[PDB]
A paper describes a structure:
Here we present structural, biochemical and genetic evidence that ppGpp controls Escherichia coli RNA polymerase (RNAP) during elongation via a specific site that is nonfunctional during initiation. Here, we dissected the effect of ppGpp on elongating RNAP by determining high-resolution cryo-EM structures of the E. coli transcription elongation complex (EC) and uncoupling functions of ppGpp in stringent response and genome integrity at the molecular level. To visualize the binding of ppGpp to elongating RNAP, we conducted cryo-EM studies on a ppGpp-bound EC, consisting of the five-subunit E. coli RNAP (α2ββ′ω) bound to a nucleic acid scaffold mimicking a transcription bubble.
To reveal whether the ppGpp binding affected the EC structure, we compared the structures of ppGpp-bound and -unbound ECs. The structural alignment centered on the core of RNAP indicated very similar conformations, with an overall root mean squared deviation (r.m.s.d.) for the main chain atoms of 0.23 Å. The cores were practically identical, with 0.01 degrees rotation and 0.02-Å coordinate displacement calculated using Cα atoms.
Residue numbers in the entry:
A (entry chain G): 99 to 147
B (entry chain G): 246 to 635
C (entry chain G): 929 to 932, 948 to 977
D (entry chain G): 685 to 831
E (entry chain G): 1320 to 1373
F (entry chain F): 2 to 890, 913 to 1342
The structure:
DNA sequence: CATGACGGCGAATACCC
RNA sequence: CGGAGAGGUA
DNA sequence: GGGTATTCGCCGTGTACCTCTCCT
């Protein structure tokens, strides 16, 4: 009950707390609208990195 | 860690839904399938679909339902995620940190104990035997009546007379905390000296009932045992009912008599126009009590009584003044329980709830806590007795 | 325990006024301009 | 009109209930405070009020619809005489309203108490005297004629 | 800790994690949660010692 | 006239109003609802037949193959109710449905069938309702509570402001189908109609109209009236009807026959309009700029250019109108528009409306229904067709269509189940004209808008859900399966239907564990109506208005009986005479008043129709001819009460108990009790525990007999006859000759339930109330049930009670109880608990049940048998072993008696898995069961044989008398001897044929019964053996137990006073219970006082009769006194003539009355105070009801008279034995090491947030710390604290609580770094 | 799938320059 | 021995 | 380019205790 594990992720995944908990931390930091980041995050749009 | 998300067995051979391991299972499955569809390579559309559903699995595991629909288990009930572990009424903070279940605790239906003193409660001896059990074990080994823990446990289970003597010795001056839900203010928990009683119900002192907002139509109270010396002394010095006569909200007394006591004092202090024994002249309250008990004078008879009252001077000593008072037999009888230092006029009237509360407040302001507690107990006893006699 | 055109003095005493401006009146009875 | 009638009935009932007549030692008939049991219970303050006694022995009076409007015809009966079906059904509106009010307001009261406890949980008396010369000016609370 | 235990645990914890907030065990709720003596009443003097030694 | 059984004990009735309508069968709702469900309905309107016809036939995607339903039948249940309860299985019948598989010819003209397969298919088990309206699910008795839900149809509502700005009311309409999507229309703050399908994003309403293939011109025609501007040469003269111009100011000098009537600047009034009755001016010139604020209503084009000049719903501007006029257009369409009653909401919505044709509207609707999924024309058309226009996906029920048409003032009740274009258009029109101040919104809480679904309807709905789940699979099995020679059973799978039905009957919110404390609790549970459940409300969210007593609740819903707390106003009780109509709406009966005469014709009126009549109150005096004696009777008209003349009156209430429920109707002097305390008393009557001896209430209402009979807890004579045999377990009735059918023995056997536990572990015991040879009539009570006394509901005991304070022992509702009450076992109750010992398979080996248990002495195993199972009748106490079980590790897993549960073993049951060697205890139990079953098929056979022998004797001495052959020739020879037939034995050939059939019935099923007894009953997987032990305990009354009357007067016993200490009267008789007077005034439950007085009077009568019984007085004197007692009253309806009684009947009645004469006082037609004082005089008791009491302790007189009488007290199921609990240490939870919760788990008390706040307010820091750490999840701290306490060292060493570590780990798991710092 | 809760508040959206 | 539903007491 | 009014999604909604069934 004290030892934790880890899960290696094949792809980077966005933490839900820092995205949807208003105000969006990713949205505020990148100055993008939440809808835009969501479309990109849930695979509806592209971002010109 | 897995021991923080265990599997509860049902019907011996099978497990229910842990509701948290399922989300971990989904995340692991989706991650592995994504990684494998990244090795063999695939059309980018299905790769992106797998990446998206891995994202959905992770964001459901962290906070299920925050974005999109809430993933549902075997029943229609939403899955309870990691964020749900720590938030809300059932979350970790409010359910296990700000409040928790405790040992050395019990609960039972409360009944009235009209014979109790203000600092005492009536506690079932079975309940006390269960509650104070480690103390019983310690004392049994202390006089060598049980060599080992097992022998003491068997002795307590048999309920031998010597075990009841141990129980008598342990709780002599060890207070217990009585609580009634809801605990709206601090007087909802008070400390009392337990008195072993044969029944299964807890006996509560009448005067503290208003503090608990408690009555005897089905109410139940919880009892807790302060373990350490510091807790016992906090119970005696801070939470004991004798220290809680005043209200912290407004400073008014909160042990004020009500119902039967108020009715008894009012009836005994009422006067009648042609009551038996009217016009008598009495040497004092004792003669009034003798006349009432022998049936030679009515309780409401208007008489003249020699009353000796006491008043604090500037130095603070009690100067005595003796004079003939035009009063009733009942008022003279009630005067006997009044502590020295109060004017006789405080009882020389029909005494209602307001008047009785003013009497208690005056006693507290003039004479302090101890005379006030004694006077409150005497008032309760007298009120019950004369309400019964009325 | 919780739920859910003129002024006439009723007692005997002097009357004081604060934040007041007094001026001439037609009937001699003061009108408040403050 | 019905409120005035209720007041008259209440006054008559209380005047008849609060006094009894007694013969003096001189054979004269004298008035005194009544020894009626219910009057003693109310007067002592042990249990009951004038309003409840009025329902017991006067008239229950005007009732209100669930929307809050007062029903035109009051309950002229009292609990000693006994209500009829219509009067009892009318009174059930207020009884249900009060019970539901209590049941639903207890939660709001608990929520307010929790919020107050949190906002004030950390405040503790930590000093004997900070020496400040400021303060609030206390005066009696005055609203119209009464203080 | 107090704000998270009160309401809006997700938002409060997001604020604290992003800001990197440091919480002094100074109030009653904080010491109750970590099972320490409260800085009031009989424990008050205790915390005073804990302050003076530090 | 009274029957012989009624003569036993006649309750004196003080009721004065004649009874016109009998109280109906109190369980009619449940039985009728389920009967509708299961019985064959040829019409197919309702039930399983309707559920099949609504889904069948199922057709393939191609349609080449199909299934046709023919019929259904319900088979015989495998087990009856008792075996289902014993074995823990559902009492259900197999559903067997006749199906037909139609394969159609290929390359045929049309629908020709090549082959049809006729088969019978099993579609699962349908749980069956028992005789008393219950269900047996998994062996547990459950009640399906009826649900009060919004009726299907159209409902118009508004939010009175309180949404936006100030005072802006937004009207809306909701079409609620019984099945399908919900169609809503609403007004925005900008007065634009918007449409919402299924609470989705709001769209402009016009889209729906476009989706219905309505163009802009058609829409404007539908929702506006065309105004014309008919230009001849110039000046823009305008044709009008006068009624149009009323309401608004005059824009021009209106002219009448060439003479101006009103000039500009003067608003047109009513007199202005009425002056045009003889002034029929049609063409009126108007200013050109007046057209500026107008809207063109049609699409126009120039004659031949092909350039559309304008379209519909366009503002008409000066340039637009002028260049229109230069094109030669004679007239221009316009929309009539006002500001208060003809608002242009449709036109403005058209403006907002982004769609422009049917395709655009369909695409928009599909987009809204399917967010983010690409739209197709065919897909959009199919979705819109399926939304409201397909029978499979949308269904307005019959009640839905009825309510829909009624709300729209359509005179056709019957209609289709799907919406049409006219329906939607009419709904929009009514919403618009409600906005225009022409209609009124509907009342959501009105009982004409809320209907009742019961067990049958909900079972049918769940069955239909399962059936469509089968349909999805069978359609693809028929389409994509290359089927040949296959039978319809192959396609049908009963798993989804069975799953749905079991889910409904075991896990639904309305499938509730039956409250079985007493018969009243069963009746109330079977009669509750719940606003919760699927499609209803939630108790956390329900507001004040839905919880209130609505005026339409009168006579339909009890305004008194409702739960306290969160469920208040959401759970209701059906009224006594209330019933549902064919549409499920609650209706109540009324007497028709014709020509001022109150007739006996009874009409059941629903809430809607009741408000259209003037209905007289029940408390209205009539005469022998039925006319109202008074001239201004109180009546209810439209939800309000006032006074009317008798000719105005249309109806009258049938009874004074019409408004109350059964529990409220059981409260004597209910009209003298405050409604809150009446609610409490009605609720607590259901919590009364049946006592050792059932005791009738001295003061009742007359409803006790109805409750006792209708509850089904008693044995009621099916047919009349004479008691041929009787014993504590069985009654055998010899049926009268006029009630026997041809060829039967005429014997009725009633086997009584003996000492079986209820759902609340109370004792259910039936004991006979008839003697040997007694004559019985149909409907007579043969055996009393729990809490039943001679067929009368007997919830408690009659207690001599004094209202006086006794030294603080009755303080704050406390109750002082005399020790004589304890000695006489007045409130001693039997409680039966079931303990289960399960021997399973573990990884190591099977669990063994045996008497060989390690680490226990032989004394601890003396009560076990050789098998290791406790003997029947053994007296056991806490810790004693009932079933010895060893689990291999062996470890001691034996089932032990719970602590302080000392009781008697009264039953042991053994269930053994197939293939498992049953133990010798199981062998002997099986042998006992076999012997009892053989007796059942013989003793019943012997008694029926006796009845047949009596019948044959009676027939044979009728025309075929042969005295010699009765004794010289035995029975068997008659059956077969070879002789010529005649009238003597031809009739015997039909009556002894049934005798031979009992030779073919009882013996034939003997093998089946043996097979059932010896079969290894199926158990849970891994369960080797189950041993159920039943422990029966006598709970005696003690301090801490909860007592209550019927008036809300509840309390807890504080002391068991010795008899010599209790108050006593001048005759030395002590009282039983002392109650505080102070709880009467503020509570205002005055009935308990009156009952007390009446109770005394009742006892007084008995005290006289008993005296005459001890002095052995003549039957004449007892006749005189009892007649005087029954004749007392102010014109009571009851008439008892003792002259009709025989001397033996009078003596029996006097014997039954010697403990006090029962009194019936109906709830609003009860005994008056003067009648009570008269009865007190008859018993030589004071009229005041107050007597001189003496103090037992001292003998001294109490200074004032004390109200002494008899109150009917109940012991509630809140015993202090079940509630007292304590724990020092014990088990702990897994995730958090805090103690477990609950007495059953030996858990610790929760020290919640508010307790912590109290400790902080005290400053008790160390007490709080020890509660948080060493009394809790501080494992090391708690272990050290225990060791220190054992060592006499009361000092704690607190550490970190484990739950804080759990919180830290959980926050880590969220990818957040939270840690403690250095120091 | 459920379609009977609602008030308060801050971020985002739209309208109006 | 965790969750869900139902009911109940204060 | 800027301010303000409206819309939409999230947050919260009393404590303590007792009984039953059902749940990969
Ligand atoms: Mg209470």
């Amino acid at each position: 009950r004290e030892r934790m594990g880890h899960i290696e992720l094949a792809s980077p995944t966005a933490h839900i707390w820092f995205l949807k908990s208003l105000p969006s931390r990713i949205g505020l930091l990148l100055d993008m609208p939440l809808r835009d980041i969501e479309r990109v995050l849930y695979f509806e749009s592209y971002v010109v990195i | 860690p897995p021991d923080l998300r265990p599997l509860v067995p049902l019907d011996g051979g099978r497990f229910a839904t842990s509701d948290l391991n399922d989300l971990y299972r989904r995340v692991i499955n989706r991650n592995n399938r994504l990684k494998r569809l990244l090795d063999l390579a695939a059309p980018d559309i299905i790769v992106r679909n797998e990446k998206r559903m891995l994202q959905e699995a992770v964001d459901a595991l962290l906070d299920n339902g925050r974005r999109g629909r809430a993933i549902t288990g075997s029943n229609k009930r939403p899955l309870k995620s990691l964020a749900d572990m720590i938030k809300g009424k059932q979350g970790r903070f409010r359910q296990n940190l700000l409040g928790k279940r405790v040992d050395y605790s019990g609960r039972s239906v409360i009944t009235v104990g009209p014979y109790l003193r203000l600092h005492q409660c009536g506690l079932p001896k079975k309940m006390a035997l269960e509650l104070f059990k480690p103390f019983i074990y310690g004392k049994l080994e202390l006089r060598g009546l049980a060599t080992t823990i097992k022998a003491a446990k068997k002795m307590v289970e048999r309920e031998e007379a010597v075990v009841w003597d141990i129980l008598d010795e342990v709780i002599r001056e060890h207070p217990v905390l009585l609580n009634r839900a809801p605990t709206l203010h601090r007087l909802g928990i008070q400390a009392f000296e337990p008195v072993l009683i044969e029944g299964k119900a807890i006996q509560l002192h009448p005067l503290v009932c208003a503090a608990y907002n408690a009555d005897f139509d089905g109410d139940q109270m919880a009892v807790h045992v302060p373990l350490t010396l510091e807790a016992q002394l906090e119970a005696r010095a801070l939470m004991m009912s004798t220290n809680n006569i005043l209200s912290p909200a407004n400073g008014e007394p909160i042990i004020v008599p009500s119902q039967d006591v108020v009715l008894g004092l009012y009836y005994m202090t009422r006067d009648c126009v042609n009551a038996k024994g009217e016009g008598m002249v009495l040497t004092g309250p004792k003669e009034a009590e003798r006349l009432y008990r022998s049936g030679l004078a009515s309780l409401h008879a208007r008489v003249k009584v020699r009353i000796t009252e006491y008043e604090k001077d500037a130095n603070g000593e009690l100067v005595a003044k003796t004079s003939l008072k035009d009063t009733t037999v009942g008022r003279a009888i009630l005067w006997m329980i009044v502590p020295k230092g109060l004017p006789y006029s405080i009882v020389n009237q029909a005494l209602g709830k307001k008047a009785i509360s003013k009497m208690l407040n005056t006693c507290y302001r003039i004479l302090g806590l101890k005379p006030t507690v004694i006077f409150a107990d005497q008032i309760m006893y007298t009120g019950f007795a004369y309400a019964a006699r009325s | 325990q919780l739920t859910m055109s003129s002024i006439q003095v009723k007692n005997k005493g002097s009357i004081k006024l604060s934040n007041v401006k007094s001026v001439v009146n037609s009937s001699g009875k003061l009108v408040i301009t403050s | 009109i019905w409120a005035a009638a209720n007041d008259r009935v209440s006054k008559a009932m209380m005047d008849n209930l609060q006094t009894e007549t007694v013969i003096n030692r001189d054979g004269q008939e004298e008035k005194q405070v009544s020894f009626n049991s219910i009057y003693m219970m109310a007067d002592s303050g042990a249990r009951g009020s004038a309003a409840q006694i009025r329902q017991l022995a006067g008239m229950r009076g005007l009732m209100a619809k669930p929307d809050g409007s007062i029903i035109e015809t009051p309950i002229t009966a009292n609990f000693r005489e006994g209500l009829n079906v219509l009067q009892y059904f009318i009174s059930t509106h207020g009884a249900r309203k009060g019970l539901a009010d209590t049941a639903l307001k207890t939660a709001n009261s608990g929520y307010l108490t929790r919020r107050l406890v949190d906002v004030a949980q950390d405040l503790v008396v930590t000093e004997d005297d900070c020496g400040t010369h400021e303060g609030i000016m206390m005066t009696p609370v005055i609203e119209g004629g009464d203080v | 800790i107090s704000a998270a235990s009160f309401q809006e645990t997700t938002r409060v914890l997001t604020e604290a994690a992003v800001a990197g907030k440091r919480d002094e065990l100074r109030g009653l709720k904080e010491n109750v949660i970590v099972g320490r003596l409260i800085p009031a009443g009989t424990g008050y003097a205790y915390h005073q010692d804990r302050m003076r030694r530090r | 006239v009274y029957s012989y059984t009624e003569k036993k004990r006649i309750r004196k009735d003080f009721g004065k109003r004649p009874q016109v309508l009998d109280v109906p069968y109190l369980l009619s709702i449940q039985l009728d609802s389920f009967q509708k469900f299961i019985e064959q309905d040829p019409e197919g309107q309702y039930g399983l037949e309707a559920a099949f016809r609504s889904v069948f036939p199922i057709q393939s995607y191609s349609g080449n193959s199909e299934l046709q339903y023919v019929s259904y039948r319900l088979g015989e249940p495998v087990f009856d109710v008792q075996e289902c309860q014993i074995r823990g299985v559902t009492y259900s019948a197999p559903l067997r449905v006749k199906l037909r598989l139609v394969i159609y010819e290929r390359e045929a003209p049309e629908g020709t069938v090549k082959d049809i397969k006729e088969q019978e298919v099993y579609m699962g088990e349908i749980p069956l309702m028992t005789d008393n309206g219950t269900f047996v699910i998994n062996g547990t008795e459950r009640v399906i509570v009826s649900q009060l839900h919004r009726s299907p149809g159209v409902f118009f509502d508004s939010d009175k402001g309180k949404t936006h700005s100030s005072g802006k009311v937004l009207y809306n309409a909701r079409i609620i189908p019984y099945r399908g999507s919900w169609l809503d229309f609403e007004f925005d703050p900008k007065d634009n109609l918007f449409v919402r399908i299924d609470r989705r994003r709001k769209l402009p309403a016009t889209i729906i109209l476009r989706a219905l293939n309505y163009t802009t011109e058609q829409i404007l025609d539908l929702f506006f009236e065309k105004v014309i501007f008919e230009i001849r040469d110039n000046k823009l003269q305008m044709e009008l009807v006068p009624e149009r111009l009323r309401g608004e100011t005059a824009s021009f000098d209106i002219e009448a026959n060439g003479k101006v009537y009103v000039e500009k600047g003067r608003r047109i009034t009513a007199r202005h309009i009425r002056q045009l009755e003889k002034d029929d001016v049609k063409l009126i010139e108007v200013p050109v700029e007046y057209i500026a604020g107008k809207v063109v209503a049609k699409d126009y084009i120039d004659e031949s250019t092909g350039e559309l000049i304008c379209a519909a719903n366009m503002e008409l501007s000066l340039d637009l109108l002028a260049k229109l006029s230069q094109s030669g257009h004679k007239r221009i369409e316009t929309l009539f528009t006002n500001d208060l009653d003809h608002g242009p909401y449709i036109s403005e919505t058209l403006r907002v409306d982004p769609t422009n044709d049917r395709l655009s509207a369909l695409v928009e609707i599909y987009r809204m229904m399917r967010p983010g999924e690409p739209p197709t024309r065919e897909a959009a058309e199919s979705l819109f067709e399926n939304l409201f226009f397909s029978e499979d996906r949308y269904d307005l029920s019959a009640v839905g269509r009825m309510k829909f048409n009624r709300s729209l003032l359509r005179e056709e009740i019957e209609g289709s189940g799907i919406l049409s274009k006219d329906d939607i258009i009419d709904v929009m029109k009514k919403l618009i004209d409600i906005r225009n101040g022409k209609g009124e919104v509907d009342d959501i809480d009105h009982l004409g808008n809320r209907r009742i679904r019961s067990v049958g309807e909900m079972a049918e709905n769940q069955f239909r859900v399962g059936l469509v789940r089968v349909e999805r699979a069978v359609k693809e099995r028929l389409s994509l399966g290359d089927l040949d020679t296959l039978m319809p059973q192959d396609m049908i799978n009963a798993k989804p239907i069975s799953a749905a039905v079991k889910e409904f009957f075991g896990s639904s919110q309305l499938s509730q564990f039956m409250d079985q404390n007493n018969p009243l609790s069963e009746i109330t549970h079977k009669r509750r109506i719940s606003a919760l459940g699927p499609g209803g409300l939630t108790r956390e969210r329900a507001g004040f208005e839905v919880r209130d007593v609505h005026p339409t609740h009168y006579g339909r819903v009890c305004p008194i009986e409702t739960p306290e707390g969160p469920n208040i106003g959401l759970i209701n009780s059906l009224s006594v005479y209330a019933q549902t109509n064919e549409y499920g709406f609650l209706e109540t009966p009324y007497r028709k008043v014709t020509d001022g005469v109150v007739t006996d014709e009874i009409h059941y009126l629903s809430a809607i129709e009741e408000g259209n009549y003037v209905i007289a109150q029940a408390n209205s005096n009539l005469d022998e001819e039925g006319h109202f004696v008074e001239d201004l009777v109180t009546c209810r008209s439209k939800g309000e009460s006032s006074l009317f003349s008798r000719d105005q009156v249309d109806y009258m209430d049938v009874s004074t108990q019409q408004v109350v429920s059964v529990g409220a109707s059981l409260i004597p002097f209910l009209e003298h009790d405050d409604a809150n305390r009446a609610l409490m008393g009605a609720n607590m009557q259901r919590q009364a525990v049946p006592t050792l001896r059932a005791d009738k209430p001295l003061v009742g209402t007359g409803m006790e007999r109805a409750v006792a009979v209708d509850s089904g807890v008693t044995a009621v004579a099916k047919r009349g006859g004479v008691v041929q045999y009787v014993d504590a377990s069985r009654i055998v009735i010899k049926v009268n000759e006029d009630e026997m059918y041809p060829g039967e023995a005429g014997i009725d056997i009633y086997n009584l339930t003996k000492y079986t536990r209820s759902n609340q572990n109370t004792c259910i015991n039936q004991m006979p109330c008839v003697s040997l040879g007694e004559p019985v009539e149909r409907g007579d009570v043969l055996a009393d049930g729990p809490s039943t006394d001679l067929g009368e509901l007997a919830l408690g005991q009659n207690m001599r009670v004094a209202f006086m304070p006794w030294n603080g022992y009755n303080f704050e509702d406390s109750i002082l109880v005399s020790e004589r009450v304890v000695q006489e076992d007045r409130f001693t109750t039997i409680h039966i608990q079931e303990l289960a010992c399960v021997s399973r398979d573990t990884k190591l080996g099977p669990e063994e049940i045996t008497a060989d248990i390690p680490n226990v002495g032989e004394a601890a195993l003396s009560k076990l048998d050789e098998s290791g199972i406790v003997y029947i009748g053994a007296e056991v106490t806490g810790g004693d072993i009932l079933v010895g079980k060893v689990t291999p590790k062996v470890k001691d897993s034996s089932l032990r008696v719970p602590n302080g549960v000392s009781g008697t073993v009264i039953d042991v049951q053994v269930f053994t898995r197939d293939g498992v060697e049953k133990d010798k205890r199981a062998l002997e139990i099986e042998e006992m069961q076999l012997k009892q079953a053989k007796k059942d098929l013989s003793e019943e056979l012997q008694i029926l044989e006796a009845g047949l022998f009596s019948r044959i004797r009676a027939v044979l001495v009728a025309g075929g008398v042969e005295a010699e052959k009765l004794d010289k020739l035995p029975r068997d020879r008659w059956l077969e001897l070879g002789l010529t037939d005649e009238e003597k034995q031809n009739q015997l050939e039909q009556l002894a044929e049934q005798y031979d059939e009992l030779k073919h019935e009882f013996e034939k099923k003997l093998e089946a019964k043996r097979r059932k007894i010896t079969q290894g009953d199926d158990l849970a997987p891994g369960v080797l053996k189950i041993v159920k032990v039943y422990l029966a305990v006598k709970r005696r009354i003690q301090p801490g137990d909860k007592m209550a009357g019927r008036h809300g007067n509840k309390g807890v016993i504080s002391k068991i006073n010795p008899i010599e200490d209790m108050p006593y009267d001048e005759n030395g008789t002590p009282v039983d219970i002392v109650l505080n007077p102070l709880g009467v005034p503020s509570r205002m439950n005055i009935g308990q006082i009156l009952e007390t007085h009446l109770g005394m009077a009742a006892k007084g009568i008995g005290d006289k009769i008993n005296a005459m019984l001890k002095q052995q007085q003549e039957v004449a004197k007892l006749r005189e006194f009892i007649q005087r007692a029954y004749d007392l009253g102010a014109d009571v309806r009851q008439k008892v003539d003792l002259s009709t009684f025989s001397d033996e009947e009078v003596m029996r009645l006097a014997e039954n009355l010697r403990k006090g004469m029962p009194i019936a006082t109906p709830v609003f037609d009860g005994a008056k105070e003067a009648e009570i004082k008269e009865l007190l005089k008859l018993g030589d008791l004071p009229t005041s009801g107050q007597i001189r009491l003496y103090d037992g302790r001292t003998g001294e007189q109490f200074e004032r008279p004390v109200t002494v009488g008899y109150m009917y007290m109940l012991k509630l199921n809140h015993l202090v034995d079940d509630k007292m609990h304590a724990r020092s240490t014990g088990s702990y939870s897994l995730v958090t090491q805090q103690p477990l919760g609950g007495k059953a788990q030996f858990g610790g008390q929760r020290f919640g947030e508010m307790e912590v706040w109290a400790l902080e307010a005290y400053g008790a820091a160390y007490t709080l710390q020890e509660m948080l750490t060493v009394k809790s999840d501080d494992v090391n701290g708690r272990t050290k604290m225990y060791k220190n306490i054992v060592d006499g060292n009361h000092q704690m060493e607190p550490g970190m609580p484990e739950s804080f570590n759990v919180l830290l780990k959980e926050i880590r798991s969220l990818g957040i770094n939270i840690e403690l710092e250095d120091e």
